[model samples]
Target: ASPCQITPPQEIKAPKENVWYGLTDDETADVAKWLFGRPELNLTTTENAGEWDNTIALIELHRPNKSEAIPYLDGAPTRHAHVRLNNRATTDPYFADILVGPLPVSNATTWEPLEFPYTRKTQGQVRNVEPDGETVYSEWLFKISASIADITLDLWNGTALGLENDTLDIWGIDPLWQDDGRIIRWDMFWNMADDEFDSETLLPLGLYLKSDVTGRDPSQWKLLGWMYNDIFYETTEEFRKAYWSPGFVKLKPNVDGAWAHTEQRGPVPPQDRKQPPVMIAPDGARYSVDAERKYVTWMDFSFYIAFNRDTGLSLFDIKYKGQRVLYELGLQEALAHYAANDPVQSSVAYLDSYYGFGPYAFELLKGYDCPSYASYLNTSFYKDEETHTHVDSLCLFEFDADYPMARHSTSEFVSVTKNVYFTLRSVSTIGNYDYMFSYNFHMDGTIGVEVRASGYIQSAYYANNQDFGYQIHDSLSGSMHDHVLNFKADFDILGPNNTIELVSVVPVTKQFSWSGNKTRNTMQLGRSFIHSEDEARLNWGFNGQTQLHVVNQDKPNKFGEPRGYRILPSAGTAHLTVLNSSNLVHAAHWAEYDVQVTRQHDFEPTSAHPYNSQDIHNPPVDFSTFFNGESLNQTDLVVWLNLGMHHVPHTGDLPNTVFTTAHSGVAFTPLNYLPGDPSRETVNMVRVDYSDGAATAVRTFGQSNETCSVVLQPVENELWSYQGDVVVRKFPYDPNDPFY
Candidate 1:
C-alpha cells in the first residue's frame, strides 16, 4: 500500500457555510430586485438614471458581526445584503448604506440603515463629494482649460479644449476639498499620451487651476486662480499676461519614450534567453481545496479565503494542526501618501480601498507573476446588475527555496533539509500601481503575510522637488511616497484569551555571581506585557532587539514559558513617516504606528472604512477611536499591523518598480507553543556519515530516490486558449450564456 493512501487525496467539500465570502449569483440578483421594489428606497435602474437621478451604487453581502456569525457557523442565522444608494435626485446628493435581506427573500424581509459598522453616527449617510463627475469634467474643467488655450499652446504647444485634436488632459483631486462647507478643486493639466502607452501620470504640464464648484448650478461656480512655475496668478488672464512677458521660464514637457514602455528593449545579458530554473511538483499537488467555499488545506494549515470590494482578500479561521490560531487575517486599508513642493503631490494621499481592490484585481500573468503549474481560482464582485468574474486571479502553489531550512556539517557527518513552503497569492492593479499580496505557510508552523508593489510610480513634475524626491527622468521627479497598508490579525490563540508580551534584549552592565565584584558589559532580556491599549501602540525595536508575542498565560509549556505565536517583521515593515498628516487628518490613524494591540470588538472589526477618503476630517471609522484604554491582558486581542515601504524612486524605477525592494511583510511563528520543531516530521531530509574518506552509512528519511526522465514543454497551448474575463447578463436572467 502507499504511505498515506492507495489513491490521491479526494477534495473535501466545505464542512460548514462560508459566511465571509460574498453572496452567490442567485442570492445577489434576488436582493437587487427586492430593493428596486421598495418604495422607501426609490431606486432607479442604472441604465435609465440621468445625471440627477437616484440609482443603486452598490449591492453586496453585509459582512455579519463576529457575535452574530459565530453562532451561525455552529448552527443557523439570517443572511443580509449591504446596499449603497446614490441619492442624486436630491439637491444634497449623498450615499446611503442600507441593509436588506433574510437571504431567500420573502415577505418577512425588511430594510434599515447599516450604521453600526462605522464609528460615526450619521445613519449610514455619507455625502458624495464628486456627485457630478460628468458635469465637472465635460462642462466645468474643459471650459476652464479652454480659457487658457492660448497660454497652453505657447508652453506645451497643446490644448485641452475637449476637442478631438486636444493633446492635454485635465483632472484633479479626490475627496474634492470640503473646507468651510464649500466644494473646491485644484485641477492640473498633463500632457496626454500620444498612443496606448498610458503614461499620463508622468506627464505633468506644471499648470494648475483652482475652482470653487459649490452647487449644482454651473454659473455660481468660481474659477479662483491659476498656478504655474511655482508662481500664483489670481486669474488665467493674469497668468497669460506674465507668460507673454520675456523672463517667464517655460519648462520642458515629459514626452513619452522607450524608457516608459513595459515591452522588452535594449541589450540582453548572457544566457538571458535560456529557460530559468522553476519549481515543479513532480508528485503532483499536495493540497486539498473546497473551491465553492474558497477554502484550502496544505500540510497542517487550513483557512477560508474571503474577498470583498474594499479589501481584496482575507483569510479566516486559520488553523494549524486542527487548532485555531487566527480568526481573521486580512488587509483593512492602503494609503499612498506623497510629498513635494507642489500642491498636487503635497495634498495627495490616496486611500486605495476607495477605488476598490476587488474590482481592480486583474487576472494574474502566468509563469511570470506566479508558477505556471500553480492552481488558479476565480473571484467575483457584484457591479452594475452583473457579477464580473476574473477567472484564475488567485493562485495557490508550493515552492522549494534556494536555501535549506536546516543544515549542519562536521568533519565526520553532514545533514540538510529542503525548505519547502506553500503560498496563496493575488495581485491587484489599482491604476498605475500593482500590489501583490501573498500568504505563506511553512512546515514548522509559521504563517507569513507579504505584499510586494510593482507597476509605475506616479511621478511629479520636476522643478524644485529635489527636497522631496529624486529626478529619475527628464522633467519628471519620482515622487517620494509612503505606502502604509494596514492588516487586521484577530488572533484566537489557545481559545481567545491571549496576552501580548514584549521581550527585548537590552544592553546591561552588572556583575554576575560567577564574576565576583567585577561589572560586565552584556545584554539581558527585558520582558514586559502590554496590559492595556494605552501602551500597546509600538514600532519594531531598533536593531531588531525586541520581539512581540501573543501568548496564552494559562497554557504554558513544561518549562513554564507561555505557549504562544511570535509576531515579527519577516521582511521590512514600516509606518507612516508623516507627523499628523494634514492630507489625512483622522482618516488614517492606523498608519501612525507599525503595530497596535486592542481588545477585539465586533464594532471595531476594521481599521479604516472604504469611503474614509470622502470625509478626511470625520472619517467613518477613525482608527484612533478603537483605543480607549481597553484592557489587553488575557483577552481576545486584535493586532493591527502596518506594512509598507518608504519609496524614493531612482532611475532604476523608470519602466516600472520591481517587487525586489518594494516589499513588506510580517510572520507568525510558534514560540514555546510546541515541545519540538515540527519540521523534524518531514521525510524530505538527508544525513551522511563517513570515516577515512569512505562512506559508512547514509539516511534518506524515506524520501524518493528513484529518478525518471521527465519531458518539459512550453505552455503555448494553454496560453492561446486564455479568455480575458467572463461577463454574465444577470439582469436579463440569461443563466446559460456567459460571454467573454
Candidate 2:
C-alpha cells in the first residue's frame, strides 16, 4: 500500500430501489426499441431522423404518485417511463408527452398520450414553435442577413452568414413574442468568440432585425425591418436610405476588445507562487454512500438522490436522526429575466428548464469545485439512444467552518463547539452561466441549500440604457437581470399532516407588566396559521420580521412545544423585481412571490413544465392555478421557495461574475423540535476554567489526541488525472467499451 492510503466512503445496499430515480440504461433502450415498433407512430431513430421526421426526444422514469408511495413504501410500485416525441413529420409540428407502462416489455404493457398532470388538457401536446431551427437560420435568417452584408462589413467588419469564416453570431430572446396569435423573433448581431472561452454573450453589435416567421414555410417568412440607435424603420429600404444619407450616425459595436478575453493576465502577488494551505482528510471519509442507488448518509442525516432532465440534482426522503423531514426537495424552474432599452434584452426572459439542466452538469474539477479529499459520483442523462455520463459530477465532502458553531465566554470559564458540516454539490453550466448548487447538512442539525453563479455576463450595446445597466467594457453594457430559482420542499413533519404557522416579531407600544404606568416601545411575537391556499402566496416582510414555520400539531416535543422546522434565508436572496411581467405573462407565475403554499396534490407535482416556453399564454403547468383555495390547515402541505439574486452586472462582472458576491441560500432548521442543542453531544468541543487569567484547567471532551505525520506528493493526487467525460451507447449496450 502507499504511504497514506486514502479511505473511501463505505458502500451499503439501499433498503429499496429509489422510486424517484430515473430509468436504467437497459430499460431506456428497451423502451426506445418498443416505440419504433409501432406502425401507427412511425417514429425514426435519432441518427436517421430528418428535420421533417418524428423522433424520440427524451426518455425518463414516470415517477409514481406521492400517495402511492409513503416516504418508505413496504413494497415496490409499478414502474413506468415518460417518453417525449418531436412529432415534426407534418406542417404543424408539436411535442407530445407519452406514458409507457408495465416496464420490461411485457405482453400486457401499454402506452398512452399522458395528459393528467398538466393544466393544458390537450392530450399532452404542446406546439413546437421553433421546430425548423435549421431552416430558420439556413433558409431564412442568414439569407436575410446577406442583404445587410454591406452594412455589417462597414460597421463591425464581420458577417453572420452562417459560414465557417463568419466572425459574427446572431441570436435573440426566448419564449418568442407569442402574443396576438403570431410568432415574432427579434435577433441582434454579436461578435463571435475567437477562442475556446464562451465570451460571445459579452459582445453586442447594437443593430437589431425583426422577423415574422409565423408559419413553417420559410418562403412565407417576412423580414419586418431593422433598428439602430433607438430608431425603428418600417422597411429595409427605409433603413438603408437613412443609413446612406449624409451625416447618418452609426452606433459603436461591442467588439471583443482588450479586457473581454477571460485569461490569467494580472500580475502575481508577492510570494504568491508558494503552495497554499490545503485541507486533508487524514482520518478518512465520515459519510456513507450507496453510489449505485444514488443514496447517501451523513451522521443522522440520510437521503436518496433524484435527478431529472429539468432539474439536475434533488434530494428525496431526506431524514434527520432516522426520521423523515422532507419527502421531496428539488428545483422546479429557473428564470433569468433581463431588461434594457434594446429589443433583445427587454424581451429576453429565459425559462431555463426548456433548455434542461441535467444535460449540462459538467464534470467537477478536483481540488477546485470540491476539496481534493472529497469523494465524487457519476451522473448521466439519456439522449439519442445513449446515456452520457459526466464522471464525478456530484461531489460530497466534509469541511469545518472558520468560526465555531457555539461559543460562550465569561470571566471565569470559556467553551466552544466546532462547526463541521457535510456538503453535497453539483455544478450546471446552462448556456452562459454556471450555477453551483450545494446541499449542506450541518452538525447543528440544520439543512441548507446554497447556490452560487459564475460565468460571463450577457452584455448589451451601450447606446441609450442609462437607467438599466452599467457599462463594464468599452462599448458593452453589463445587462441587468433577475435570477429567480424555485424549489419545492415537500415537508413531511412527524407525519403528513402539517400546519403553516407565521410568527411575526412585530413592534408595538404596550404597558409592560413591570412598568407602573408608562408605555414602552417593544417587540413581541404574533402567531397565526394559514388556513387555505388563497392566502399562501407571500413576499418576505421588511427586516425579516415574519418567520415561516412548518409544524405538526399531532406531535409535540417532550416539553409540549410544537415540533416544527423554521425555513429562513441564510444568505441574501430575492424574488423577481418585476411583478406581473409583461414579457412573462402566465409562463412564469411561480416567480411572482418569495414563497407560496399549497395542499400537496399528486396532479400538481411541479410548478413548471419543460414546454411552458412553447406555449406561454396557456402554459401546461400554470403555477398560479395551483392555488385554488384548498384547505391548508393540518394537511399534507408543500412550500414553494424562491432563492436568487437581483443582479445588475457591474465592471467586476466583466470577465466573469465571482461566486463570492452572487450567492443565495435557504435553510431549514429545527424549531423547538429537539429537547436541547444537539451539537453539545459531539466530542469535538472544548472548555477552559480560569480565575484571574493565571492558573487554568483545559478540557478536551475525549477526542483523539494522537498526532500523525503528513505527506505530500504531486503525482499521488488525482488532479493530474482529469478525465473530461465518458460516453457509451445504451441501445448498442456496450458496457465493455467506454469511450471519450
Candidate 3:
C-alpha cells in the first residue's frame, strides 16, 4: 500500500483440481507433437498447407465425460484432448473430430475419431462445403462477376473481379442450400466499406446471383441464376439484356455513408466530461481467484471457470453457502436466424459456434466493458499450432446496484441492504454482431445468466422487403432476426437426485366456509411434477403466472417445502419465432423451446455441437433426440435454457445496436432452499431510527468507515494498457517469444 492502502484477497490453492480448465502449455504441446507423429494420418503444417494436406483445425481439453469426471473431481480426473482435424487431404474435405489422450502422452495414448459426444453416427466427420473458398472466389466467382461488370459498373461504379482495386464484393449463405444432392449459394453484391469504418454489411447492392457449387471440381460448378430488383432471370446475359432495354428500371444501391458509421457524433451528455461513478474495493479484491486453477471464491459463492473455442466461458461446480447448486452452467449455442425477401438474407442463418466464441472474445475496454478495478483473466484458443491469447477477455467484479436488495420503512425505523452482486463477463464478436454474456451472483442466493447484444445489424435491400423488415434508411431494411442463445444448467440442488416441480397459479372459483358459503373467483398454486423429458420441453406461462422449481423432494425444508432453486425468466427472454426453421433443420433444435430438461447422460454432454451446421438435416447433436422420454423426477438432470431478444433492428440500431435496448436474461433464485432471507447475513446494511427529527443512531454493524483517495484517470489508464490478442507457438513449442 504505497499511496493507497487497500487489502486484496489472498491467493490460495483450490481444494480440488479444476478438471474443466484448459490444458497447460506443455500438455498441449505434447498432444500436438504426438498427433503429428501418427503414421496413419499424414498431417501438414499451416506454413506449407495445400488441398492435399491435412492440418490441425483445433485442439483443446477434451472435457472428460461426466461419467468418468464426477468420481475423481475431488482427486485426479483422467485427462483427454479433443482435436479437430481439417482432413483436406481427401477429395471430400471434411472436419473430423478426434479424441487423443489418457494424457502425459505415452504408448497408451492413441488417436481415434470421437464417437459418443455427438449424435451423428458418421465416424465424427462433417463435410466441409467450402473446401477451397480462396479458389472458389478467384478461380470461379470472380470470373462470373466479371461477366456482369458492364451492369455492375453502372449500378455502383464498382466491380468485383478479384482485383485489388475492385470496390464491390460478393459472399453468401451458410450450410449452403443442400437439396437433391446439390449445394447451392445465393451470393449478393455488396459495396465494401472504406478503411475507416466496419460498415460493409449495411451496404447491399440489390443485385443477387446464384451458384451451384456441388462437387470439388471447380469446372462443374454452375451459375444458376441472377436476380435484380426482385425479378429473376435464368442467366446473367438475360438480366443484362433487360437492363439495356429502354424501359427497364434500376434500384438505388445501399452504399456506405455516415449513417452506417459508428462514432461519437451526437451532442455530449450532461456532465459528460467529468468522471462518472466507479466501483472500487477499498478492501481491494473481495473475491479470490486461483489463476492457475481458474477457481473463484466470492462471499458465499464459489465456482471453477472453463473456457473453450466454441462456447467460450463456462462455470463448473457452482456452489453457494458451501453446498452445490449448479454442477455446471455453460452456453451451448447461439443462433441468429434472419428473415428477408431477398434470397441472400433469407437463406442465411448463423450458427455461431462454427465461427467460435473464444477466438473472437477480444480484449475488453477496461472502464467500458467492465469496471477498471475488476479482475481480468486471459483466454486462449489453439489455431494453426499457435495458442492465441485474448488478453483480459474475461473479467470478474462486484457491482453495487443503484437500488437496495431489501428495504422497508414504517413510522419510526427504516433499513436498507446494499444490492452488491458479483459478475463474470465476456464479450464475443462473431462476424458483425457482438454477444456480451454476463453471469451474476446475487446477495439473495440467486444466479443470473444474461446476454446482451450490440453490433451492426445485417440489413437487407429495402425493395420488396417491407413485409420482412422495417425500412430504416434509403434502400435499406433493418432485417428482422431472432437471436436464440442456448445455455446448459445442470442443477444438483440438494443432491444429484432432483425433480422439476411446476407450481402454477390458476384462476379458480372457490366456495369458502368463512365467507358465508359464497363462491369467490381467485387464484391458487397448482403443483405438479414434470416426470419425463418428453414433457419437459417447457415455456413460460401466460403473463408469467407459472413458476418452475428444480427441487429435491427427499430433502424438504423444515416446513415440508422442497429444498430447491426456482428457475424463471427475469426479463426479455424468447425462443425462435420461426417454427421448424427451414434455415436450420436439426442444427438448432435446442433453440425451439424456452426450457428443456433431459436426464443427465455421459454421451449427451452438449445440447448443440459446433459442427452441427455442416449437416443441418442430420446434425451431430439434435437436441430433440435428447428428449426421448427419460424420467426427470428424482434423477440427475440437465436443464437446457434459452435466453435471447427478438431483435428487429429499427432506425436506432442502424450503425450499431446498443446493449441497453437489446438485452435478455434468465435468473435462478432460492425458493425454499433457505429458511430465512439470506440478505440478513450481509453486513452492508443500515438502520435509521426516528421519523420527525433527522434520523439518528445510524448503525453500521461491523462495517468499516475507512475512505481512500484514488487517482481518477477516467480514460487514460485503460487506453494506455489495452492490448489485443497475443500469440504463442505450441506444436514446435516456441515459449521464448510471445508475439502481440
lDDT (Cα, tens digit) per residue for candidate 2, span 26-84? 88878877888787889987888878999888999998898887845533778999999
- Give per-residue CA lDDT, model 1, range 1-740, as digits (tens): 23322223238887777888888888887887888788877877877787798888777888878887666654545789888888998878888888988888899888888888789889988877777888987788888777778878888899888778989888867656777788788878888875878677878877888899898888898989987778899887798888889888999888788888788989999998997886666666778899888889998898899999888898988989988899899999999998888877877889999889998877777776788778888888877777789888899988898898898999999999888999999899999999999999999899999999988888888888889998888899998999999999988888889999999999999898999799999999999999999999999999999999999998999999999999999998989999988888878999999999989888787888878877877888988988899899899899999999999998888889999989999999999999899998889999999899797989999997755444566755567656766877656456688886
Worst 10 residues of 1 by lDDT: 1-10
Best by TM-score: 3
Candidate 1 clashing pairs, residues 3+ apart or interchain: none
Scored by Cα lDDT, where does model 1 land? Answer: 0.85
lDDT of each: 0.85, 0.88, 0.88
Rank ordering of all candidates by TM-score, starting from the highest? 3, 2, 1
In model 2, the runs with Cα more than 4 Å from the true position are: 1-5, 71-75, 512-514, 691-696, 714-717
Could you tell me every candidate's TM-score relative to the true structure?
0.97, 0.97, 0.98
Clashes of 3: 0
Instruction: List model 3 lDDT by residue over 75-181, tens digit each.
Output: 37678999999988877889989999889899999888897887788888888877787888987889998888888898889999988899999997886887767
Pairs that collide, model 3: none
Angstrom error of the Cα, residue 217, model 1: value is: 2.1
Number of the candidate with higher lDDT, 1 or 2: 2
Which residue segments of model 3 deviate by more than 4 Å? 1-4
The alpha-carbon deviation from the true structure for residue 269 of candidate 3, after best TM-score superposition, in angstroms, is: 4.4
Candidate 1: stretches off by over 4 Å:
1-10, 71-75
